[PDB]
Structures are given as C-alpha cells and as structure tokens.
Design an enzyme around this catalytic site. Sequence first.
Site, PDB file in Angstrom:
ATOM      1  N   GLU A   1       0.802  -1.220   0.000  1.00  8.42           N
ATOM      2  CA  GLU A   1       0.000   0.000   0.000  1.00  8.42           C
ATOM      3  C   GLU A   1       0.840   1.279   0.000  1.00  8.42           C
ATOM      4  OE1 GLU A   1      -2.604  -3.252   1.792  1.00  8.42           O
ATOM      5  OE2 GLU A   1      -0.529  -2.529   2.049  1.00  8.42           O
TER       6      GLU A   1
ATOM      7  N   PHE B   1     -10.411  -7.258  15.108  1.00  9.39           N
ATOM      8  CA  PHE B   1      -9.389  -7.564  14.130  1.00  9.39           C
ATOM      9  C   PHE B   1      -9.242  -6.397  13.134  1.00  9.39           C
ATOM     10  CE2 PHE B   1      -8.257  -9.903  10.125  1.00  9.39           C
ATOM     11  CZ  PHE B   1      -6.920 -10.092  10.474  1.00  9.39           C
ATOM     12  N   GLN B   2      -8.034  -5.825  13.089  1.00 12.93           N
ATOM     13  CA  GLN B   2      -7.656  -4.700  12.188  1.00 12.93           C
ATOM     14  C   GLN B   2      -8.419  -3.412  12.423  1.00 12.93           C
ATOM     15  OE1 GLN B   2      -7.807  -6.403   8.216  1.00 12.93           O
ATOM     16  NE2 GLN B   2      -5.779  -7.364   8.527  1.00 12.93           N
TER      17      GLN B   2
ATOM     18  N   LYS C   1     -17.062  -0.935   7.053  1.00  6.39           N
ATOM     19  CA  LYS C   1     -17.538  -1.991   6.160  1.00  6.39           C
ATOM     20  C   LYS C   1     -19.070  -2.022   6.068  1.00  6.39           C
ATOM     21  CE  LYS C   1     -16.230  -5.856   7.789  1.00  6.39           C
ATOM     22  NZ  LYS C   1     -16.043  -7.259   8.316  1.00  6.39           N
TER      23      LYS C   1
ATOM     24  N   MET D   1      26.689   4.770   3.827  1.00  5.67           N
ATOM     25  CA  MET D   1      25.544   5.677   3.946  1.00  5.67           C
ATOM     26  C   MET D   1      25.739   6.778   5.011  1.00  5.67           C
ATOM     27  SD  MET D   1      21.932   3.699   3.629  1.00  5.67           S
ATOM     28  CE  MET D   1      22.230   2.243   4.599  1.00  5.67           C
TER      29      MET D   1
HETATM   30  C1  LIG Z   1     -10.610 -15.486  10.058  1.00  2.00           C
HETATM   31  C2  LIG Z   1      -9.879 -15.773  11.394  1.00  2.00           C
HETATM   32  C3  LIG Z   1      -9.984 -17.034  12.007  1.00  2.00           C
HETATM   33  C4  LIG Z   1      -9.327 -17.295  13.223  1.00  2.00           C
HETATM   34  N1  LIG Z   1      -9.461 -18.528  13.784  1.00  2.00           N
HETATM   35  C5  LIG Z   1      -8.872 -18.778  15.021  1.00  2.00           C
HETATM   36  C6  LIG Z   1      -9.049 -20.114  15.712  1.00  2.00           C
HETATM   37  O1  LIG Z   1      -9.728 -20.984  15.173  1.00  2.00           O
HETATM   38  N2  LIG Z   1      -8.441 -20.320  16.934  1.00  2.00           N
HETATM   39  C7  LIG Z   1      -7.688 -19.324  17.533  1.00  2.00           C
HETATM   40  O2  LIG Z   1      -7.136 -19.477  18.593  1.00  2.00           O
HETATM   41  N3  LIG Z   1      -7.519 -18.080  16.900  1.00  2.00           N
HETATM   42  C8  LIG Z   1      -8.103 -17.812  15.633  1.00  2.00           C
HETATM   43  N4  LIG Z   1      -7.904 -16.580  15.039  1.00  2.00           N
HETATM   44  C9  LIG Z   1      -7.120 -15.626  15.740  1.00  2.00           C
HETATM   45  C10 LIG Z   1      -7.964 -14.997  16.856  1.00  2.00           C
HETATM   46  O3  LIG Z   1      -8.832 -14.040  16.277  1.00  2.00           O
HETATM   47  C11 LIG Z   1      -7.037 -14.276  17.913  1.00  2.00           C
HETATM   48  O4  LIG Z   1      -6.107 -13.519  17.234  1.00  2.00           O
HETATM   49  C12 LIG Z   1      -6.313 -15.260  18.806  1.00  2.00           C
HETATM   50  O5  LIG Z   1      -7.154 -16.362  19.205  1.00  2.00           O
HETATM   51  C13 LIG Z   1      -5.936 -14.514  20.049  1.00  2.00           C
HETATM   52  O6  LIG Z   1      -5.038 -15.334  20.745  1.00  2.00           O
HETATM   53  P1  LIG Z   1      -4.777 -15.076  22.320  1.00  2.00           P
HETATM   54  O7  LIG Z   1      -6.012 -14.752  23.103  1.00  2.00           O
HETATM   55  O8  LIG Z   1      -3.869 -16.234  22.761  1.00  2.00           O
HETATM   56  O9  LIG Z   1      -3.799 -13.796  22.379  1.00  2.00           O
HETATM   57  P2  LIG Z   1      -4.058 -12.325  22.847  1.00  2.00           P
HETATM   58  O10 LIG Z   1      -5.092 -11.539  22.107  1.00  2.00           O
HETATM   59  O11 LIG Z   1      -2.663 -11.683  22.901  1.00  2.00           O
HETATM   60  O12 LIG Z   1      -4.698 -12.350  24.328  1.00  2.00           O
HETATM   61  C14 LIG Z   1      -3.805 -12.827  25.362  1.00  2.00           C
HETATM   62  C15 LIG Z   1      -4.516 -12.461  26.692  1.00  2.00           C
HETATM   63  O13 LIG Z   1      -3.541 -12.775  27.686  1.00  2.00           O
HETATM   64  C16 LIG Z   1      -3.340 -11.604  28.499  1.00  2.00           C
HETATM   65  N5  LIG Z   1      -2.005 -11.633  28.976  1.00  2.00           N
HETATM   66  C17 LIG Z   1      -0.922 -11.201  28.334  1.00  2.00           C
HETATM   67  N6  LIG Z   1       0.169 -11.421  29.086  1.00  2.00           N
HETATM   68  C18 LIG Z   1      -0.220 -12.018  30.245  1.00  2.00           C
HETATM   69  C19 LIG Z   1       0.428 -12.499  31.409  1.00  2.00           C
HETATM   70  N7  LIG Z   1       1.813 -12.364  31.584  1.00  2.00           N
HETATM   71  N8  LIG Z   1      -0.328 -13.102  32.375  1.00  2.00           N
HETATM   72  C20 LIG Z   1      -1.637 -13.213  32.264  1.00  2.00           C
HETATM   73  N9  LIG Z   1      -2.297 -12.789  31.181  1.00  2.00           N
HETATM   74  C21 LIG Z   1      -1.616 -12.192  30.158  1.00  2.00           C
HETATM   75  C22 LIG Z   1      -3.638 -10.466  27.607  1.00  2.00           C
HETATM   76  O14 LIG Z   1      -4.008  -9.289  28.390  1.00  2.00           O
HETATM   77  C23 LIG Z   1      -4.773 -10.981  26.812  1.00  2.00           C
HETATM   78  O15 LIG Z   1      -6.010 -10.669  27.484  1.00  2.00           O
HETATM   79  C24 LIG Z   1      -8.539 -16.314  13.833  1.00  2.00           C
HETATM   80  C25 LIG Z   1      -8.434 -15.048  13.210  1.00  2.00           C
HETATM   81  C26 LIG Z   1      -9.101 -14.777  12.001  1.00  2.00           C
HETATM   82  C27 LIG Z   1      -8.977 -13.401  11.323  1.00  2.00           C
HETATM   83  C1  LIG Z   2      -0.909  -4.969   4.403  1.00  4.34           C
HETATM   84  C2  LIG Z   2      -2.170  -5.740   4.106  1.00  4.34           C
HETATM   85  N1  LIG Z   2      -2.966  -5.458   3.044  1.00  4.34           N
HETATM   86  C3  LIG Z   2      -4.121  -6.185   2.769  1.00  4.34           C
HETATM   87  C4  LIG Z   2      -4.542  -7.203   3.597  1.00  4.34           C
HETATM   88  C5  LIG Z   2      -5.855  -7.983   3.299  1.00  4.34           C
HETATM   89  N2  LIG Z   2      -5.546  -9.387   2.901  1.00  4.34           N
HETATM   90  C6  LIG Z   2      -5.601 -10.344   3.831  1.00  4.34           C
HETATM   91  S1  LIG Z   2      -5.172 -11.922   3.127  1.00  4.34           S
HETATM   92  C7  LIG Z   2      -4.892 -11.208   1.569  1.00  4.34           C
HETATM   93  C8  LIG Z   2      -4.420 -12.097   0.421  1.00  4.34           C
HETATM   94  C9  LIG Z   2      -3.247 -12.971   0.954  1.00  4.34           C
HETATM   95  O1  LIG Z   2      -2.550 -13.522  -0.139  1.00  4.34           O
HETATM   96  P1  LIG Z   2      -1.386 -14.603   0.128  1.00  4.34           P
HETATM   97  O2  LIG Z   2      -0.224 -13.896   0.810  1.00  4.34           O
HETATM   98  O3  LIG Z   2      -0.865 -14.983  -1.264  1.00  4.34           O
HETATM   99  O4  LIG Z   2      -1.913 -15.778   1.038  1.00  4.34           O
HETATM  100  P2  LIG Z   2      -2.965 -16.843   0.530  1.00  4.34           P
HETATM  101  O5  LIG Z   2      -4.389 -16.521   1.074  1.00  4.34           O
HETATM  102  O6  LIG Z   2      -3.054 -17.009  -0.973  1.00  4.34           O
HETATM  103  O7  LIG Z   2      -2.390 -18.133   1.090  1.00  4.34           O
HETATM  104  C10 LIG Z   2      -5.177  -9.806   1.652  1.00  4.34           C
HETATM  105  C11 LIG Z   2      -5.053  -8.915   0.425  1.00  4.34           C
HETATM  106  C12 LIG Z   2      -3.719  -7.425   4.723  1.00  4.34           C
HETATM  107  N3  LIG Z   2      -4.033  -8.402   5.695  1.00  4.34           N
HETATM  108  N4  LIG Z   2      -2.548  -6.726   4.939  1.00  4.34           N
HETATM  109  C1  LIG Z   3      12.757   6.335   4.727  1.00  4.49           C
HETATM  110  C2  LIG Z   3      14.061   7.035   5.011  1.00  4.49           C
HETATM  111  N1  LIG Z   3      15.034   6.531   5.846  1.00  4.49           N
HETATM  112  C3  LIG Z   3      16.186   7.204   6.083  1.00  4.49           C
HETATM  113  C4  LIG Z   3      16.423   8.434   5.513  1.00  4.49           C
HETATM  114  C5  LIG Z   3      17.763   9.162   5.802  1.00  4.49           C
HETATM  115  N2  LIG Z   3      18.624   9.196   4.563  1.00  4.49           N
HETATM  116  C6  LIG Z   3      18.587  10.308   3.799  1.00  4.49           C
HETATM  117  S1  LIG Z   3      19.689  10.115   2.418  1.00  4.49           S
HETATM  118  C7  LIG Z   3      20.102   8.488   2.892  1.00  4.49           C
HETATM  119  C8  LIG Z   3      21.062   7.609   2.079  1.00  4.49           C
HETATM  120  C9  LIG Z   3      20.501   7.595   0.632  1.00  4.49           C
HETATM  121  O1  LIG Z   3      21.200   6.638  -0.108  1.00  4.49           O
HETATM  122  P1  LIG Z   3      21.014   6.600  -1.667  1.00  4.49           P
HETATM  123  O2  LIG Z   3      19.552   6.352  -1.976  1.00  4.49           O
HETATM  124  O3  LIG Z   3      21.853   5.444  -2.148  1.00  4.49           O
HETATM  125  O4  LIG Z   3      21.400   7.980  -2.308  1.00  4.49           O
HETATM  126  P2  LIG Z   3      22.908   8.523  -2.484  1.00  4.49           P
HETATM  127  O5  LIG Z   3      23.082   9.575  -1.445  1.00  4.49           O
HETATM  128  O6  LIG Z   3      23.905   7.388  -2.358  1.00  4.49           O
HETATM  129  O7  LIG Z   3      22.863   9.215  -3.818  1.00  4.49           O
HETATM  130  C10 LIG Z   3      19.422   8.204   4.111  1.00  4.49           C
HETATM  131  C11 LIG Z   3      19.633   6.871   4.804  1.00  4.49           C
HETATM  132  C12 LIG Z   3      15.404   8.947   4.698  1.00  4.49           C
HETATM  133  N3  LIG Z   3      15.473  10.207   4.109  1.00  4.49           N
HETATM  134  N4  LIG Z   3      14.270   8.255   4.446  1.00  4.49           N
END
Ligand SMILES: Cc1cc2nc3c(=O)[nH]c(=O)nc-3n(C[C@H](O)[C@H](O)[C@H](O)COP(=O)(O)OP(=O)(O)OC[C@H]3O[C@@H](n4cnc5c(N)ncnc54)[C@H](O)[C@@H]3O)c2cc1C
Ligand SMILES: Cc1ncc(C[n+]2csc(CCOP(=O)(O)OP(=O)(O)O)c2C)c(N)n1
Ligand SMILES: Cc1ncc(C[n+]2csc(CCOP(=O)(O)OP(=O)(O)O)c2C)c(N)n1
Lengths: 567, 541
Positions: free
Chosen positions: A57, A119-120, A169, A500
């Site tokens: 993006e 989510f997101q 959405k 650099m």
């Molecule tokens: C289309 C889709 C399908 C999915 N299907 C599944 C599925 O089938 N099964 C699945 O599991 N997930 C699935 N996911 C992912 C799901 O949505 C969650 O991302 C995932 O289950 C969250 O995992 P979690 O609760 O372990 O982690 P987290 O969201 O990180 O939650 C962890 C919890 O633990 C707490 N915590 C953190 N540190 C500590 C600590 N030191 N002590 C005590 N508590 C703590 C946090 O505060 C939090 O409340 C799916 C996602 C998508 C988009």
């Molecule tokens: C940065 C970003 N842009 C868009 C999305 C929405 N999105 C989720 S899955 C997907 C297609 C994933 O393609 P691929 O990496 O080839 O995995 P596949 O489902 O084919 O195994 C998109 C566009 C996202 N999660 N993150």
């Molecule tokens: C996203 C990002 N990270 C870091 C910088 C800092 N920065 C400015 S110029 C440069 C080096 C550029 O290298 P190059 O593209 O090879 O150009 P040259 O000076 O060698 O002509 C950096 C790291 C920046 N401007 N943007």
Amino acid sequence: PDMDTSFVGLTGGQIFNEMMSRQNVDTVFGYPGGAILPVYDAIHNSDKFNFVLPKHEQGAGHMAEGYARASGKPGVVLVTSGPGATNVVTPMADAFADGIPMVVFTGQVPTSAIGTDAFQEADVVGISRSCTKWNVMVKSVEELPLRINEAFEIATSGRPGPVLVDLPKDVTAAILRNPIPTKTTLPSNALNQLTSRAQDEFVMQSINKAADLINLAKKPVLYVGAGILNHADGPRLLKELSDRAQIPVTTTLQGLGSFDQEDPKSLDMLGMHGCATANLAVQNADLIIAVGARFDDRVTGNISKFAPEARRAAAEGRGGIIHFEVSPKNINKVVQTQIAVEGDATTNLGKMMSKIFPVKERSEWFAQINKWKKEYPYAYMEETPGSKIKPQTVIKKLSKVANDTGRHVIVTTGVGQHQMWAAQHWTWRNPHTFITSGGLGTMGYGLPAAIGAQVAKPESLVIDIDGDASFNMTLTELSSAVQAGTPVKILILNNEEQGMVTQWQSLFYEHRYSHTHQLNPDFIKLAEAMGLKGLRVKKQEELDAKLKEFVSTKGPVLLEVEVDKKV
Amino acid sequence: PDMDTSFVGLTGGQIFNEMMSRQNVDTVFGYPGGAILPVYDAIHNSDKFNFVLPKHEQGAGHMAEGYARASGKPGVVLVTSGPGATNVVTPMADAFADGIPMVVFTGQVPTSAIGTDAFQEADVVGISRSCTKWNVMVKSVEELPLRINEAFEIATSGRPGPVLVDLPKDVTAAILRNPIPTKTTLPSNRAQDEFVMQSINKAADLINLAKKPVLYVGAGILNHADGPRLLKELSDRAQIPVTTTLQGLGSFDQEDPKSLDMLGMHGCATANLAVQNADLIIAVGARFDDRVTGNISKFAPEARRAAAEGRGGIIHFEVSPKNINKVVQTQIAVEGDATTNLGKMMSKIFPVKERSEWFAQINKWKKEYPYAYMEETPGSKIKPQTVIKKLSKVANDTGRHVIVTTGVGQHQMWAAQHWTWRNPHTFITSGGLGTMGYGLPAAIGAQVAKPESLVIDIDGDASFNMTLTELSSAVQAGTPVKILILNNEEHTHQLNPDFIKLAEAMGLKGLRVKKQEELDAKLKEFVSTKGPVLLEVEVDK
Ligand SMILES: Cc1cc2nc3c(=O)[nH]c(=O)nc-3n(C[C@H](O)[C@H](O)[C@H](O)COP(=O)(O)OP(=O)(O)OC[C@H]3O[C@@H](n4cnc5c(N)ncnc54)[C@H](O)[C@@H]3O)c2cc1C
Ligand SMILES: Cc1ncc(C[n+]2csc(CCOP(=O)(O)OP(=O)(O)O)c2C)c(N)n1
Ligand SMILES: Cc1ncc(C[n+]2csc(CCOP(=O)(O)OP(=O)(O)O)c2C)c(N)n1
Ligand SMILES: Cc1cc2nc3c(=O)[nH]c(=O)nc-3n(C[C@H](O)[C@H](O)[C@H](O)COP(=O)(O)OP(=O)(O)OC[C@H]3O[C@@H](n4cnc5c(N)ncnc54)[C@H](O)[C@@H]3O)c2cc1C
Ligand SMILES: [K+]
Ligand SMILES: [K+]
Ligand SMILES: [Mg+2]
Ligand SMILES: [Mg+2]
C-alpha cells in the site's frame, strides 16, 4: 430540487463509484482487503476507472503522489483497514509536507465494532490527524457523498494536501434507502465563485502596493516555489512578468520546471545546494518577489544575514520582501515581510500584470550576475582517462539524450546525493516535470512516483533518477510497473562502496570517511526476475551507448551505473 | 537527595549505549538518518551491539517483533525522523495488537525546531499515540536515562507492547554536564494481594472439584520464561487436557497425550467439543476472542451449567483488569501474571491420578473428527496443507530447534492447523493486525535471536511480495532463513516475479516445485541447505 433520489437503492460501494465519476476521477491506486471489499469490488471491475495495483500500500500512496504532481489532479488511494491504512501513513505525511492533493479512503471495521479491539481496528483518524489537512469516519451511507465531496474540496483548495476518509464496512455495504439533500451530493465549484466588494478591494490594495514597488526597484529577483505550479497558468504568467519587467528568476527545488532554465533571465536553483549566482543575487537584491515559496531553512541562510540588501532597502523604505502566499499562516512565519498578497499566486499575478511598467533593461543587473555565473558555475571533479564515472556526468549526458527524443520528459528521484545532483545538473524547462520528495525526503519515492506519473502522462518519457539505498526501499514495485505496463526508465546511480553514514570529512576537498554499507541485490538480475529489461554500465566507454539504449528501449527498463564514491 | 555522576561528560549517545547495556540489550534493528545519528553512531561503532540493517524501516520493525517473539526479550528499533518514524507505524500497530514488547527510538529535529515545520518534523508522538502503550519526547539529556528505563519497564510489563521514545538530535548530541538523581538511572525495581491470594485459593478449590476440566491457553503464558513449564506441571498434576489459541501454539507439546491442539472456528473438533462439555474452563493468558468462542451465549454450555449449580464455571488468569469479565462473566478471576499465579497456586492443587472417562471421550473424538481437506489425486496439483504436513515432519527429523513464521492469508491458518507444534516461542505470526509481509522480516529477526534454530517462513505469494526487498537483508545479516512460498496464483490477478530468479538476484539459493513427485526431495534439499534459501511450491487454488 431539495432532495436527491438518484442514489436510492444503491450500495455504499456503488455510491462511491458514482461519486468518483462526479469528481472526474479516472484513476485509483489501491489494494484489496476484507474491510474495503464493498468499495473495491464496485471500483476494481469498472469500465470507468483505471485501478492500479501496487505490491504494497505504500506504493499506492506514492504512486498517487506522482500521479497528482504530474497531472494536477488529486491522487486517489483505496486501501483496507488495519495494516492497509497504517501502510499509507508515510505517503500521507509526504503529501502533507509537499502540499500534494491526495484523497485516501481506508476500509474500517463495522461502526458497531469500533472500540472493541476488533481484528484490524486501527484508530486511523487519530493516527493520520497530524499528517492530513482533514479527516473523517463516515458513519452512515447517507453521509458518504457528503464526506467524499468535502474530502476532494479540502484536498484541492488553499495549499493542496492529503485528506483521509475512513469507511466502515457496514456503511459501504449498506443500501441507501432514503433521499438525501442535493447540497450534500453535488461537488463544490470554487469556479465561477462570487466575491464581495470588501473582498475584492482588500486584495487589490495589496496588489497595487506591490505593483508600484516592483515598478519602483530595479535590482529585483523573482523567487519562485511550488505554489506557482498549482495553477495551470502560473508558469505562463510568471514568464510574462519576467519578460515585461525584465526580472531574473530563481526557483526552489520544488519550483524547478516552472521557468525555462535556458531563458537568459534564469538564475536556476537557490539555497544550500543551489548555484552561487542565485544565492548571491538574493544576499543582494533590493526586492525579493516571493511567489508560492515558503523560505525553508535550506533556502534561507541564517534568517539574519539572509537578503540584507533587501532588508536595507526595506529600512530605507525602497524595497524588501513581497510574498504571494495562499496560506496566511505562512506569511511572516519565517521572515518578516513588507507586503503580503494573499490568495492564489497565479490569479494575483494576473490581476497585477497591467499595473506593471514594461522595462527596457537592467544591465548593471543583467550584464552583472551573468558574470557571477562565469566565476561560479557548478563545479565537480570531472572524468579523466581511466577514472570512475561521475554521477553529475551521467545526469548531464542523460539530460541531453532524453532531450534528443523531443519528448515530454518527467523526472522523479529517490532521496540523497543523487536527488541534489538531478536537481542541479538536469536542465529544467517545463512545468510539472520534476517530481521529488522535498519536504519529508522519503527514500523509496522514486519508482512508485514514476509509475503514477506515467499513468498520469502516458505519452511522457518518465525517468526515475534513483539511489541504490533509496531504490531498495520500494523495489518490489518493479513488478507493478510491468503489470501496469508503464514504461518507466529507472536509473540506479550505484555508489554502494561508500557508506551511507559520514563519520567525518576533510575541511576543504570534502574527502568523506563513511560507514554503514548495505548489501545490494544484482540489479540487472533483479530487473529480469521482475519482468523488465536490465542494463549495466561499469566503465566510461560504455556510458553513451547504454544511456541511448536505456532511453530508446520500449517498455520499462532499469539501467544501473556504477559510479564513483566520492561526490 | 542521592546523585549520580557516572554519566557526566558523556554524550547522550554513549549514555544511550550504557542504558541499553543495563537493559541487557545486545541487538538493535534500524536504519540511519541525520536526526538519529548521535545515537546510531554510538550503537554502530560499539562491538557490544549487533546492529541489524534492513532495506526499509518497516522491515526493522517486523524483525524486532520476530526477535522479541523468539527470545522473550524486547525488540529494540532505532530509526530517523520523518519518514524513518512513519515507516515503523505498521510494525508498532502490529506489536500493539499482538502484545509484543518493542521499544522504538525515533530521531527528531532539535528541541528548538519543534513547531516550525522543520525538515522531517513529524508529530511522531501524536501519530503513534494509539498504537503504543506509552510514548514520550525526551527534552533534555538529563532525563534520557529516566525515559529509557520508563520505556523498557512499560514495554515489558502488564500486557507487553510497543512504546516510542522520540529523541531530538540536540538532546542525544549533548554532553551531560550535571549530576542526575541515582533513581532515574536504575531499571525499574494489600487489599489487592489478599484479594489475589483469595482468588488463587478459590481457583485451586474449583479445579480440585472439577471432573472434566479444560485448560484454555493463549499468548499470555509465553510472557514469562517459566510459563510453559508450569502449564505442563499443572496439566500433569491434575490430569487436565490443554487446548491453545492460535497465539498459544507451541506453549504445550501437541504430541503430549493430553493435548487438544487448537481451539476455535478453525481449531479441531476435539478441542471445541472438550470445551463445550467441560465443567470447568481454566483460561490462562487468553482473550476469549470470538474466533475462539463463536457466539458467546452458546460458548461452554456445560461450564455455564456447572457455574449455575455451584460446581464449576470459568476461571481467568489475566494480567489486565480491563480484560476481566469483558467478554464472558467468570466465576473467579486471578489478576496478574499467569505464570506467577500458576506457581503460587500449584501446591494447593490435588494430584489427580486419572480422568479415564474424560480422556476416553476426548480420544474417541480425536478419532472421529480429524482435520479434513481434499488431498492429492494422481496428476492433481499439490495441496498446500500437504506441503505443510510434509515439511513439519522433515523439519522435525532434522533434530533441530525449529521456528516458524508466516505471512497472512489462507497459508497462515493452514500452518497453524497442520504443523505439529512442540516448543514455546516457535510460532511467530501476525494475528491481531494481520500484516501481510510479516513473514520474511519476522524470520530474519527470529533467526538473529536464535542463531542455531532452523527458521522457516511459511509464506503466500501476495504477502511475500509486500516485503521481499528484505531478502538481501537476510544475506547481509547472515541469517540462513528458509523461505517457503506457497504460490496459488494461477477477480484480482497479481503479476508475481520469478521467485527463483529473484532469490538468486538477492544472493541466495532458489528452488521450485511444480509437481507432486518433486516435492519430497525438494523439501529435504530446502531444509538441509546451509545458507538462506527460497523454495516456491506451486499449489492448487
Ligand atoms: C478469520 C480468522 C480465524 C481465526 N481462527 C482462530 C481459531 O480458530 N483459533 C484461535 O485461537 N484463533 C483464531 N484466530 C485468531 C484470533 O482471532 C485471535 O487472534 C487469537 O485467538 C488470540 O489469541 P490469544 O487470546 O492467545 O492472544 P491475545 O489476544 O494476545 O490475548 C492474550 C490475553 O492474555 C493476556 N495476557 C498477556 N500477558 C499475560 C500475562 N503475563 N499473564 C496473564 N495474562 C496475560 C492479555 O491481556 C490478553 O487478554 C482467527 C483469526 C481470524 C482473522
Ligand atoms: C498490508 C495488508 N494489506 C491487505 C490485507 C488484506 N488481505 C488479507 S489476506 C490477503 C491475500 C493474501 O494472499 P497470500 O499472501 O498470497 O496468502 P494466501 O491466502 O493465498 O495463502 C489480503 C489482500 C492485509 N491483511 N494486509
Ligand atoms: C525512509 C528514510 N530513511 C532514512 C532516511 C535518511 N537518509 C537520507 S539520504 C540516505 C542515504 C541515501 O542513499 P542513496 O539512496 O543510495 O542515495 P545517495 O546519497 O547514495 O545518492 C538516508 C539513509 C530517509 N530520508 N528516508
Ligand atoms: C537532501 C535535501 C536537500 C535540500 N536542500 C534544498 C536546497 O538546497 N534548495 C531548495 O530550494 N530546497 C532544498 N530542499 C527542499 C526543501 O526541504 C523544501 O522542500 C523546498 O525548498 C520547498 O520549496 P517550496 O517553498 O517551493 O515548496 P513548498 O514547501 O511546497 O511551499 C510552497 C509555498 O507556496 C504556498 N503555496 C502553495 N500553493 C500556492 C498558491 N496556489 N498560491 C500561492 N501560494 C501557494 C504554500 O502554502 C507554501 O507556503 C532539500 C530537500 C532534501 C531532501
Ligand atoms: K540545472
Ligand atoms: K497441529
Ligand atoms: Mg547511494
Ligand atoms: Mg496466495
């Protein structure tokens, strides 16, 4: 009529599609995802829009920037929720710093899920608040045309810039059931807009005071920036004034191309990396006419010693600074001004033109300066037999080879030494042909900006003068170029062997000692993997033939030139 | 008032280095630029730090996440002002969603230039406010130790997450001229304790009462080094079957007879049935996500009935009080670090010799309801689930410690389901934000954290294209990551590069599988290859 029924029965996605047409959008840069699906599906497969897909993006965002800067139209971005949105923050910030009209639409989780850590679910309106002119979350489908119209108007007025519209959405999937006010569905005009006596008189007073002052002084310089490019007619009126009153013209980095650098009255670029003739003219000068430029730190020295000859003429009531500026805040923000002419620079030049006394000549000025040039042209250590290739030489040769085609040529760049070498050593002639990240300095800008510029201007020759570290930032977009068919010419000035990061350097002959080397890919193998032609120059003897082939080649092409590591 | 003179005469850059040392940091991910130079130079020039250079700051951020997930340590990111900072917003939001400790240092224009639209003045504190636990702009070199210690403490406590510390260039370049309070230099260091001990006792009582308990375990168990050990100890002591969320995978050995594997919408039927029939759910570091529970009112009906009858229900070991009783009403909440509280609880748990009927029901279910998918037939294209299953076995037979990262898409779910998870801190996947392009830089950072581990990125073609520029970073960092591309690209059609020629251009081995008969050999060659290697398998859509 009061109410508009034309959208009743349409989904938000279909309304979006209709609204793009009403805004004269024919190009959208974006990337799919679940949250933006209702809109993406309505747009992506439609005869009315060219939907251009990047691999990331951020690439859509910089593509939209290059498209806007090449076309003078807003660049429109469509991405999904969460990482889709957070991935366009750098292009928004870039557009905000450089005053580039961009309308960003981000898919969002449903309105009922906001604030549940869904989510997101990102707080995109909060994240983007400081890098947009305005933003909003659309809360119902009824409100969707309203917010779209507001977004395009704000993005393109005052100083142009990015705006963001967050699209839940459930809102874009919903069908509009009831009529909405016609006021909210018609785009703003800002064209054939009426004004009052009070308004008219106000501007005309500042216009008269400045028309008399330019007519007064005869050591003036036009100091021109990006703002002259924000009206189709800016460059024409700029040359018209230059000619009529025989006024020398210097530009900022972002004003390059607004004035023909071939014209005898061209001072070329000013500032830190500008040429001595322009800068000296400014430390002197009894009158600086600043036109759509904001007096950046790299353009002005220290404010105190900056243009004291103008400051003395001001204290002696005989000159100073005139500022043609659209945003009242940027007036007297950095330097203190004698006369401010608020509003669109080009419009105000037009109003002022008749009140300007035609001038014969200034040759203690014109014949002067014209000798400042001789004693200070751009200088660099040029090639000797066996020596490494100088990047400045490449850029000069390339400028000529591109010119020989007689084509309209647009140049984008990355960020670094090569960016300044491009600014300095290319010969700038036409408006909207230097597209570079100036206010934020985003490495990786060059390639996707070139792709978006090429879409804006399909007949143009589009060249990305890039650095090796910059190019690595966004090089995945090479396949995007091939997929879009955009025949961009990507030049990599590869100076990888120097670091650099400058750790220190000699007082005079700037011998630089540097560290932090990045491992480059093989750029020619890379280009071929991505589906385009790759060329490499390793030695002086092959440079001319390869530059010619680079430019002559049909289709996208990458030329790597290995260059000398010390300036 | 106790004063410290030991930093006096040092630049902010050397002070930064010393604070990194005190925080046990030896690895930093980032990318140079003018505003961060005083700090970047100090870190780059010191042989006490491995500075890992990506091609894009987003890559540094996801590397730091991979490093944190693999090592248990915070990931430290160092970038410049303006676009350096804005380029790490996606990895901050990613770390924020998944609860990953990360400390981000951004160079900033000088303090005097704040509010002047200076070159690369971004309001980074404003931009990152909603995707960090906390952030701050350091205003003087005197407060640099204080803010650094504050940052690490916040990043690594409660639910871990990202913090951002904005560093004006005049501050980091400055020499410290004055003594500063000793407190500010030293890393961190009753009605509520009694309520927690009461809850621990009540939780022990409910567990001791349960006839059909289930441990429901998530990411939070991985936030203490001893979490998995105590989980296993409790599971053995009280003979309790264990199911994990997606983010808890690896925290329990799936080859253990008591493993239920993953629960949820995409989990296996046996895990879901156990949870549906349990008289007691013991939730440990898990969020009760709706992808796990489904319709909350229909979730754990037997536990709800036991609660109604005073003989079971739901226990929740949760570190953030805001997350308690947010989704499900619980009978007992044990607030605080799960590992710590399991440790305090353990001696109160009655050792249970057997739950024969309960494990017999569970094992019957395992037989009746395995994961199912249409497998290969003669001449058919390869199924991605088959690749993953075969690769899990090949990787395990190496005898090595194996870490898996993924991209985002169908392959991410197939990896979770069809890989056999055995060890903690080995499944590194973007769950909360779902950032495409995560897999490659996360694998590089995980490999830096665990240089002896086999690190495999199970990736999709679209996800991989997001961040493929980091392939050359893997070569430069000397991280021999194994990149698997499941290419199901035959609506929206994207042009892929030639992934094998791409890998070669970037400096590493490239392998391709097109047909079933090539797959076994190539998977073996893939994992046995010494350096970094990319294997593309063409799979069905
Ligand atoms: C289309 C889709 C399908 C999915 N299907 C599944 C599925 O089938 N099964 C699945 O599991 N997930 C699935 N996911 C992912 C799901 O949505 C969650 O991302 C995932 O289950 C969250 O995992 P979690 O609760 O372990 O982690 P987290 O969201 O990180 O939650 C962890 C919890 O633990 C707490 N915590 C953190 N540190 C500590 C600590 N030191 N002590 C005590 N508590 C703590 C946090 O505060 C939090 O409340 C799916 C996602 C998508 C988009
Ligand atoms: C940065 C970003 N842009 C868009 C999305 C929405 N999105 C989720 S899955 C997907 C297609 C994933 O393609 P691929 O990496 O080839 O995995 P596949 O489902 O084919 O195994 C998109 C566009 C996202 N999660 N993150
Ligand atoms: C996203 C990002 N990270 C870091 C910088 C800092 N920065 C400015 S110029 C440069 C080096 C550029 O290298 P190059 O593209 O090879 O150009 P040259 O000076 O060698 O002509 C950096 C790291 C920046 N401007 N943007
Ligand atoms: C490595 C590097 C080095 C640099 N060094 C230099 C240098 O040496 N020389 C140099 O020039 N730049 C240099 N810069 C670029 C500098 O940072 C600024 O980007 C640049 O000077 C701004 O030029 P500008 O004022 O024309 O454009 P802008 O920043 O876009 O400002 C234009 C002004 O015009 C106003 N305006 C906009 N539209 C209108 C309108 N329609 N009517 C009236 N007013 C309008 C705007 O409000 C604004 O005040 C460098 C950048 C980089 C990355
Ligand atoms: K020039
Ligand atoms: K499994
Ligand atoms: Mg370079
Ligand atoms: Mg795919």
